Structure 1
Amino acid sequence: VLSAADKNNVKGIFTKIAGHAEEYGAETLERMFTTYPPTKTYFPHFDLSHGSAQIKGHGKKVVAALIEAANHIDDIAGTLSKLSDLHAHKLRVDPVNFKLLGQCFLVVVAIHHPAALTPEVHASLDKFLCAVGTVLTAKYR
């Protein structure tokens, strides 16, 4: 339910990933496609090669939405309502894929900001990413 401390830890880690929107987004996707090859299923029309312009382009969009979500954490369902129908009702990304992307995104921030990803902040991003995942696959069941 994102207690007051979770909100500060999450916004405190998005201050050091704010500038690196395209960079961290391209790497989090390339890790998802590498460690979990089945996730490539939902991008059959993309160039999944390393350093492709599409992965770097769509990757920026991915963490830019997470950045927009970190700013408005009192209301994540409303700030990601547009993407809710895209992932749950138009693409139907199976929810276990969001756990995978959040896992890869945690790996990226652990690589570039190991000092910041202290285990208190670790527990807060997992709370945060699991809420973003729920928003993107809550209109079902």
Structure 2
Amino acid sequence: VLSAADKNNVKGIFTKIAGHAEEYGAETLERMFITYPPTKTYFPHFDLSHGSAQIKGHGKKVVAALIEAANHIDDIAGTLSKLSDLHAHKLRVDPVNFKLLGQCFLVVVAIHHPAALTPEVHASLDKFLCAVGTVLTA
């Protein structure tokens, strides 16, 4: 599970993320769509060109949901269970895709806050993202 150090490491890095939800979320999605083009299949209703209004709005929601889970890190499943039915039942998102989006989020964090993303913080954030992915695929 998430240790006490994991939780403080995650909360610590998110003090740098929390003010950039739209910017970092949009960049995470744009990186995912360009690096892993098959992920575009889940967004046929979107304009997927750079900086489109739909990508910006959706990216803000994704990161906002992560911030929610960070604020209630003691029960991530309780905060995000409302997204489980959407992703696992309605959308049928292949579980491999959560690792792809998580990789893109870590790249965004590394680009903007390289000194904060130490090996130990990286380890904690990987466990946090894996825990979120398990809730959303449940």
Structure-1-length-normalised TM-score: 0.97
CA shift at 1:73, angstroms? 0.9
Structure-2-length-normalised TM-score: 0.99
Q: Distance in 1 between matches of 2:97 and 2:134?
A: 11
CA shift at 1:95, angstroms? 0.5
Q: Distance in 1 between matches of 2:80 and 2:21?
A: 17
CA shift at 1:45, angstroms? 1.1
How many residue pairs were aligned? 138
CA shift at 1:37, angstroms? 0.1
Structure 2 gaps, min length 5: none
CA shift at 1:52, angstroms? 0.3
Q: Secondary structure of the residue that 1:17 maps to in structure 2?
A: helix
Summarize the alignment of residues 75-90 of structure 1 with structure 2, pairs less than 5 Å apart: 75-90=75-90
Q: Does 1:72 align with 2:72?
A: yes
After superposition, give the CA deviation of every residue in 1:33-62 in whole Å (9 maximum; x if it has no partner).
000000000001100000100000001000
CA shift at 1:90, angstroms? 0.9
Structure 1 gaps, min length 5: none
CA shift at 1:92, angstroms? 1.0
RMSD across aligned positions (CA): 0.5
Alignment correspondent of 1:21: 21
Q: Distance in 2 between matches of 1:75 and 1:90?
A: 23
Q: Percent identity?
A: 99
